[PDB]
Each structure stands twice: as structure tokens, then as C-alpha cells.
């Protein structure tokens, strides 16, 4: 359900609904590392959209502290397909 | 074209780790060798059980999870003291019985010269005097027949130990015939 292709410079975004909860482990405590997404998931009309519900993005997506500790930020683009 | 248990027991350096199903593996020689590594706890033992895991007996009735000694000393059951709760929690903190890495838990594993003051009070024995002879009634047989061969290093007052020894409830002492300070520790 995850895109997981090696990413790049595009910054993942979150919608107003879930702003501030992890994209991997969907958690409500301590954000750590900025989310990067693949270029295909940010191409064209997809730029700036929510990495969970493809809707309008209002904030930067983050991996939680527990995910970065477990290096779950190094597994590829976390855009849900 | 598969080993037998006794045939495979003859090939391996450690035959007591071989089991019934071990001859049915795709590579039993590697399996038995890994079963003998100087570590590596074994499998949870209920893989072949058809009763799955835990459960099994609901017969036993368990009382409410008992609170730790210090917490039960805090007198929780109105004036409440916080400093007592703090100082007591940190200063009165104790370490519970931990278990080794090798040890594993199973469904049936939760069930399987000095005398106390209460036993000396119930037996009718008086306290130790200053300079006199007050032996226990089991010491007369040791003075008559001789010292016990099972514990030759034990000392009793009157026979091997002097009367002025005896202090409180200590009616015996075992006398068996360096730089022990740890290196880096806080002051």
C-alpha cells in the first residue's frame, strides 16, 4: 500500500485532517525527521498534496521519533497508493 | 533415505539434543549443530501442542496483584503526605527478582546453629544469659555422643565455643578453615 520507490527533494505534505501524526506508525507523539517523497508522487497536479489522502496539504509530513530511531525513514517514499 | 534417531546420535558430538522429529528435517546435521551452539535458547515447546498457547486450566483462583512492600507501607487504602510518597518511592526503592536470558516461561511454570526468635519463643527456650550455660536440648546429645560428622566446622557454646559465643538468638557459628574493593564507583 506504500509507494516505496527511492525518493528525492520533494517534501511530503499532510492535510488538515491528520496534521502532526506519523505516516508510518500513525502516532500522536514527538515528530522528528521531515518526509521526502518520490518524484512521480509529486509530479504535475500531485505537488503539495497529502501523503495519506491525496487531498490539499497544509503542513509538512514528519516521521515520528520512534520511526527515525528504527530507521523507518530510510525505506522509500511513504505515499499511500 | 533418512537417518534414524540412533544412527544420527552416533554422528553428532552432542547426542542429548537430538529429538524425535530431528531426523525428519531437510538438513538434520546443521539443525543439531545449531541446537548445540553455546547460546541460542530453544523453541517455545508448544509448536506441536494442539491446545495452542496458555489457557488449559481455569481451576486456580488468583488473588488481586499484591502491591510492592514500600507502596503497601505508604498506607494507601483524609491527610496525604507527598514528601513521604517521594522520599519513600526513591529512598525505599528495591529491586524485584529478575530472571536470566536463558530462562523461558511455560503454562505450568508459575506453580512448580541459628534459630528464629518465634520458634525459640514457642519451643520454651529462654534467652541467652551473660555468663552461664544455657544449651538447647539438642546440644546434650551432641555433648554426650560427640560432634556431628556432617558439619565438623560447626561450633556450639559449651563444647567448642566459650560461654562469654552466645548473643541473642545465635546459638552457633560456622568457622570454616585480595583487594576486594570495586574499581570505579561513586563516592
Amino acid at each position: 500500500i506504500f509507494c516505496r520507490k527511492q525518493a528525492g527533494v520533494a517534501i511530503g505534505r499532510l492535510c488538515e485532517k491528520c496534521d502532526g501524526k506519523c505516516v508510518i506508525c500513525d502516532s500522536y507523539v514527538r515528530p522528528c525527521t521531515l518526509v521526502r517523497i518520490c518524484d512521480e508522487c509529486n509530479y504535475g497536479s500531485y505537488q503539495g498534496r497529502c501523503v495519506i489522502c491525496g487531498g490539499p496539504g497544509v503542513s509538512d509530513a514528519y516521521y515520528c521519533k520512534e520511526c527515525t530511531i528504527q530507521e523507518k525513514d530510510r525505506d522509500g517514499c511513504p505515499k499511500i497508493v | 533415505n533418512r537417518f534414524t534417531v540412533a544412527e544420527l546420535k552416533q554422528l553428532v558430538a552432542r547426542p542429548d539434543v537430538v529429538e524425535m522429529h530431528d531426523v525428519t528435517a531437510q538438513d538434520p546435521k546443521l539443525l543439531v549443530h545449531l541446537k548445540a551452539t553455546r547460546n541460542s535458547v530453544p523453541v517455545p515447546r508448544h509448536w506441536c501442542f494442539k491446545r495452542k498457547y496458555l489457557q488449559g486450566k481455569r481451576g486456580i483462583e488468583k488473588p488481586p496483584f499484591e502491591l510492592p512492600d514500600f507502596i503497601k507501607r505508604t498506607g494507601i487504602q483524609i491527610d496525604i503526605d507527598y514528601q513521604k510518597l517521594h522520599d519513600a518511592f526513591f529512598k525505599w526503592q528495591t529491586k524485584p527478582k529478575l530472571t536470566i536470558h536463558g530462562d523461558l516461561y511455560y503454562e505450568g511454570k508459575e506453580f512448580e546453629g541459628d534459630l528464629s526468635d518465634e520458634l525459640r519463643i514457642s519451643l520454651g527456650m529462654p534467652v541467652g544469659p551473660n555468663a552461664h550455660k544455657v544449651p538447647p536440648p539438642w546440644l546434650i546429645a551432641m555433648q554426650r555422643y560427640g560432634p556431628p560428622p556432617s558439619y565438623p566446622n560447626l561450633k556450639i557454646p559449651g563444647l567448642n565455643s566459650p560461654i562469654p559465643p552466645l548473643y541473642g538468638d545465635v546459638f552457633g557459628t560456622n568457622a570454616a578453615e585480595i583487594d576486594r574493593t570495586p574499581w570505579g564507583e561513586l563516592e
Binding site: - | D114, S116, P137, A141, P149
Partner: protein, 160 residues
């Protein structure tokens, strides 16, 4: 059974680690066993102490014999008249010698034992030569002060 010593005459103050702590000076007591009752759920006064060597069990049987533990006649051993509440420190020959002062015994007496331990149950049966010795035992021995145990002698069978 040879390395283990059967202890009899334990009160409520004695416990399972308490007997091992008291028998530690006699020898290396490896384990202690106390059979629990079914109606009360406690010890019946008789237990066992399994040591490592038989010499330690012999020393514990020769040292802790007829002792007063917890106000009870504790004694260690190698594991128509009815006498109840008798001390386990006495044997059949000792009971025959104690019964010889009142009257003449017809044969050797027998003491009941538990089916689990086999040291002492608590009751015994002894037969006299005539009814005069039984009347003297019911008059004098029925209530006499034994070794820290009040015994009670009674008639096993009587016809009205």
C-alpha cells in the same frame, strides 16, 4: 527413605523452611516435605526431611529425638485397649516397657502409621492379659503424664 528422616509432633508454629533450618545444624537437609490435609488444608504434625547422606539423617534422628519444638514432642525417625494422642518418640518396645508396670502384656503391641509417611499416625492398640490390667490402665494410665503428650486410654470394644 533411608536418607530421609520422618519427623513427628509438629505444632502450628513449625513450617516447611523452619524444619530445614532447624535440621541444618545436624546435616545437609536437601529438601523438606509437609503433607497438607484435605479438610483443614494444613500440616497434620508429621513431615519428612530428605538429606544428602544417611549419616546426617542418623545424627538428626539421634539428636532431635523427643525434643520440645513449638510446645510439641517433635522426634525424628528412620522413614482390647486403644491409646490416643501418643508421642511419636516412643517405640513398640518402649510402649511394652511402659505398659509392663501396670499389668502383663500378652504380646508385642502395635502402633498405627500413616499410609504416606509410615512413622506415626497418632493412635495405637494394645492388648492386656486380663481385664484387671485393662482396668488399671483405664484408671491410672488413662490420663497419665507421658513425654510432653497427654495420652488417653479407652476400651476398644465393650458389651452393655
Amino acid at each position: 527413605q533411608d536418607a530421609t528422616v520422618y519427623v513427628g509432633g509438629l505444632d502450628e508454629k513449625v513450617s516447611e523452611p523452619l524444619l530445614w533450618e532447624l535440621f541444618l545444624q545436624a546435616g545437609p537437609v536437601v529438601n523438606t516435605h509437609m503433607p497438607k490435609d484435605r479438610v483443614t488444608g494444613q500440616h497434620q504434625g508429621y513431615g519428612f526431611v530428605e538429606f544428602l547422606s544417611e549419616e546426617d539423617a542418623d545424627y538428626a534422628i539421634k539428636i532431635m529425638n523427643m525434643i520440645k519444638l513449638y510446645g510439641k514432642p517433635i522426634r525424628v525417625n528412620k522413614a482390647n485397649i486403644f491409646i490416643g494422642n501418643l508421642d511419636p518418640e516412643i517405640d513398640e518396645k518402649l510402649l511394652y516397657d511402659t505398659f509392663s508396670a501396670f499389668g502383663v502384656i500378652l504380646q508385642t503391641p502395635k502402633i498405627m502409621r500413616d499410609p504416606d509417611t509410615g512413622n506415626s499416625k497418632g493412635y495405637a492398640f494394645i492388648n492386656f492379659a486380663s481385664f484387671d490390667a485393662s482396668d488399671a490402665a483405664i484408671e491410672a494410665m488413662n490420663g497419665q503424664y507421658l513425654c510432653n503428650r497427654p495420652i488417653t486410654v479407652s476400651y476398644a470394644f465393650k458389651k452393655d
